[PDB]
Design a protein around this ligand. Sequence first.
Ligand SMILES: [Zn+2]
Lengths: 321, 191, 203, 488, 125, 82
Amino acid sequence: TGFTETTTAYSKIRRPLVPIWGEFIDQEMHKECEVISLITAYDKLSAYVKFCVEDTLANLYRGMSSAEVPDILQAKVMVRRLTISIVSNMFRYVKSNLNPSTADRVNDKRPKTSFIESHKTKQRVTPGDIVAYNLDALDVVKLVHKIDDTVPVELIQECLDCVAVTATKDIYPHQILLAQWVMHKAFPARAFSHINKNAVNHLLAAAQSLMWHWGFQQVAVFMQVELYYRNSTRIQIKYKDVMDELYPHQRQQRAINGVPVAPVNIAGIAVQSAHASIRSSNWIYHGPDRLFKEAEQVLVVPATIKSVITELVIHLGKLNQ
Amino acid sequence: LKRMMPTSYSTAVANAGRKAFFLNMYGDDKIYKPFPDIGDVIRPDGVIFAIRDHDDDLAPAEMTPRALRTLDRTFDRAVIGTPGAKVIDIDIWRDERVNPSPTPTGMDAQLVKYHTHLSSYYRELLKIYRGLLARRKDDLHITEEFERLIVTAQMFLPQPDNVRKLSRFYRLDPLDEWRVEVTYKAQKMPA
Amino acid sequence: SEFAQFVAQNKDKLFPKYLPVPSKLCFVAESTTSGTYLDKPIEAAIDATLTFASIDASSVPLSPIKAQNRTMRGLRLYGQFYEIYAKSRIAQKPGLARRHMFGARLNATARAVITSISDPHDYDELHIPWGVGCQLLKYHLTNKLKAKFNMTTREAFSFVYENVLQYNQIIADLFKELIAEAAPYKGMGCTFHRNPTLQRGST
Amino acid sequence: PDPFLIEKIRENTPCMNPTLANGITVEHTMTRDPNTGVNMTRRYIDSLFDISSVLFPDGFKYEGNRACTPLKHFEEITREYNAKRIANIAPTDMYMIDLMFSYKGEMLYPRPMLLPAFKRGNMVTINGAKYIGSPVLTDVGFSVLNDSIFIPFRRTKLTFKQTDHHYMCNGQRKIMYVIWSQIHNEMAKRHIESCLAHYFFCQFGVTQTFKQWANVDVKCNIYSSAMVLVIPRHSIFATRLIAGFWYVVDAFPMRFTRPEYVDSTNLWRVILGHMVFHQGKVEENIDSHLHSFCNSLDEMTIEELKTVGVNVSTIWELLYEIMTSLAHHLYATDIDETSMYGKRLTVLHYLMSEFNYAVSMFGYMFQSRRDREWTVQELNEGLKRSFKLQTAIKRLTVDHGELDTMSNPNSSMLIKGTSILVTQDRAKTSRIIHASIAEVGQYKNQPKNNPDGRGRLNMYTKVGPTGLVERREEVREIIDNAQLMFRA
Amino acid sequence: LLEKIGEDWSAAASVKTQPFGLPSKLNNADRASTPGRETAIRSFGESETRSYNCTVGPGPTAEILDQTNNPLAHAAVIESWLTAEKPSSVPVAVDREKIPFGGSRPVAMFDHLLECSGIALEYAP
Amino acid sequence: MGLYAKVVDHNEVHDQFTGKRIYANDYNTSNSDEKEEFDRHFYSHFQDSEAIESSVSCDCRAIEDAHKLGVICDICNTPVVN
DNA sequence: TAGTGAATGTATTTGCTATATATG
DNA sequence: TATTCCCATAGCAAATACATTCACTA
Ligand SMILES: [Zn+2]
């Protein structure tokens, strides 16, 4: 019922300045105030609008101060109503504009429970359990022998000697991912985001010793390092059969043009995530000196670390059957 | 006191899907069985089922066959009932218009088995009414109980592809892909 | 006389140049499937803060008279908020003062029905049920399990929660060891409360 | 036990009334007519629109209600909004009906509506929770509490009180009671209270008021203030009329400058409006108010008063009998407040209150816009604005005192099921002894809410077809003898 | 037999808190997450603190409240139990030199609101 | 010797405050970009009825790792606190 | 050199705004 | 833990599905 000519702002309606105002409007909120700012009856209208508004929470939550509401409503009335009894029309327009999905409501909360206890959003982890796991992570030798009891004490001791030096450095995602994988048989993985830094540094040394014992020196060198200064989640043909046996639960894929797609191995997804993190930056070695020599190794990345990481995951899969 | 034993009936509800998946609480190295069947009993520690959050980067740790059998009290969520109670009924609601389903493969054999039988039960109910409506055009009178039952069947069965899917709710609570309800009975010894 | 003395002594701290907006924790907005819920007494605080913001956000710069008039309206809104908040949220039966400053929901507590010890006994001893003992003494048992049986924290927590609803001989032995280790006291100290609390004896 | 013993025990034991034991809410809401197959609740909806048809513009009709198929029932509750179809799978006991309206022979859009269904034992499931629906023991016709006659209509509720005013007759000061009631609500939104004689003067002329009802030829026995009214030397009703007239006149003497203007009609209306509320608006406003007042006596309320023995056909006849026959209830009541014999077990009047509210407001909209041409689009928007999908059931679990949560640890249906009785005072959220409690209630069953035994229903009570409590003759003498000793 | 067989017993050593840092109430979703109800019990009301302040004394009474109102103090209690040789015979649970009084959340909220209004409660000199 | 009431000096509180100071005067709510930032500092918003699965965080919830406690966020310029 | 899958760009669909006397 | 409903319609933004290309692997 409206008209677009540029007067697009009047297209949903049911005088001399109408074209100029429409063009200015077309060229972020409450733009009527600015167009009114370009340019008694004015005071009478302002008083009437203030009376209409005189007789909320939703306006305040949307950012409309109670002082600014009459001015905005007056600008809307002047632009969208006067340009097209007048008193009754203005009254109805103001009343409609004052109170315009269910999720857009702004309700009043009604608060034996106290007013503070009325807000019922919980944390997910018991505070006492976090304190318990902080102490647990300090028992490195006990934890390592809970996973593989054949690890010599000297190897664990050498790894733990570097904790003090690397305690001043910040920990990076690739370090935590590998520690979570290896240590999960004795230490929960999700606790890594809750334990303090000193607890994490001990676990990083613990996992490094286990990888050293198993024969994965090429990847164990990156557990205790410092930051110096194509992304395909597919599994190589060599290991695809083994990984599907050890991690049978895979992620389903969206069908393309009705054609079904084979599931993607979730364990392969995590391998690529760790592989991408390692090569995202250069690292400075801080770990045991003897381990650095056994890896044929500031710290250069071997061209086949993804294969080594895949074999490490294969070892863990066999160990946790 | 052995002659003054009451019996209690209660229901446990679990939701899985986009946020969490079921754990292997009643199965073995070769079978995935999240919850006991009809006629089974609740295992001695009292856990009926438990769910673990979705996280792909922790798959080599949290998704090993051993980790799926071990319940973590601090970080998982479980529903606990009376140990030794006998499961007598199961009801499952599924949201089939998900592409792709967030459930990992091999974790829904038990869920599908009960849902398939339940769908057949509701499908036959809707078929019976439609046959009656065809024969008795404008002469078909049904009780208020039967009318609400047919409404439930349509809420359960999948919608035709031509129309928008249903967003199922339980009293302002949105359903996930799977909703499981387990009913069990326990006999109490007064002491 | 009192009001004159108050002003004459505190006149140096009654006209500040800055005012602090209350903490983020005071104003809590909860958005749900049926809208966003807010606390009504907070309204004046929101209005007062927005009023000062609108002074520099006006399209036409405000004249000095209009600047003062809007400033006073904002200040009058702050005064309304603090009085109403103290009257409605700090000072009432489920208020901040009477529910959290002079009361609390404590950790390491239990609640159950009571029965009698009619056999020969000491008048100041208590017997707690198995389920209460396992959950109340969770960290006491975890300490013993780690040391005696070389359990990890995850295993100890799993062991305790597993045996809440069933009898376990190992747990029973640890319970006696905990009680016997409270020497020279007869057992573990506790307080028993009966409501309503009027006389010495209800606690 | 010996099988012969049980037969002799059974032979010697009276049986309860199956209507009360099986649940009376079910019998009053879901019972279907054998001829037509439509239940009591739907018939109640039809009766509501019959009494409201007098406010309908010409050409507008109510065509009845129809049962919806489950397919439409499913489609209506899963209607798409904002590209989303919300389905609530929590179990409920609801069924859907359509309300049919026509305008000048053209059928309008049907309005779907949900209604609750009850099962054996007064059981109903609403949004996944189980409830019990109990009857309410209510007075028939009218209720008296304290110098007040409460009369409930389908669209209004009126209370009649008393005041005393002084008038001078033949030079002798006299005191008479003036009956008043508040019938307009902006009067509450606001000293003189609205007198019934003032309403009579607003409707009829003062001379007409006296001659038509009191058969008194009032002129201009001499009655004066404390202007003359003259009556032949050869009633109480006339005395009340005189007292009300002087009660109105004394506090508004400027209006009556000339005596003849007393016999007018517009002046009384102006005074009434100034009591309630500019003269121009006031005169027009009441002319509509008196129009709605003259049509406030619905047919259903007439039948209720007929049982008590009032026999009123127009609202003016009711006011006459309040001033003549029911006046003594204001100061000397002869009805025992603590009795339980002349009462009725009512279900629908409290169950369908929210729907009844919608029907009344729909009729009032037509009254407020009389003498107007109606378009089909306007009528469709009006119907949609009032009769919505969940109009009737939107507050069943909020403030209905006859619906309560169910908690029954055993299989018995009587103990806390069909034996719950709700007093009229607690219908929407004690008293001294009476021998009727032993017959209607359970005087030893004393819950905390009703320690006097009136909160439970005797399962052997005799109840009529419409829910009226009847008397049992085989225990009449023993009940009567105890009542004498209670008050002695 | 009568109902209420006492199956709704509660016992908890550590409970989950709010964003504010105080023990929270239990909803139906968390009711069955544990074999028994792990809810903090309001064992110290205003009336009890009136009685304790007179018999036991204001000193020890403040210690009991602070061990919960201050979440860091509660963390110290758990560590004392776990590291103790005899968990049931700990001399002192909270070392008040390392964690001094003044960390209670309800009191800090009280002081903050009054400070914004422009006043503070202080000891009389 | 009992408790009495004092009067605080607000500008002294302002002077002794530590950290970057945000003034509500420098915010135009009409600009939808500035309204979001204003609501970031004023309200403590909860997007649903779900439990908070985090122990420490910065102001803008960019860091939820307990081992980074004390490190200042680069997006909200807020230290990571418990 | 042949087969395959990730990165990229582009056309299509759909959800999202923005305006439109009256019942103790 | 919160519900008892949401006027119709044209343009836009972002999400989504499909085709194309280049680099890695066999
Ligand atoms: Zn941040």
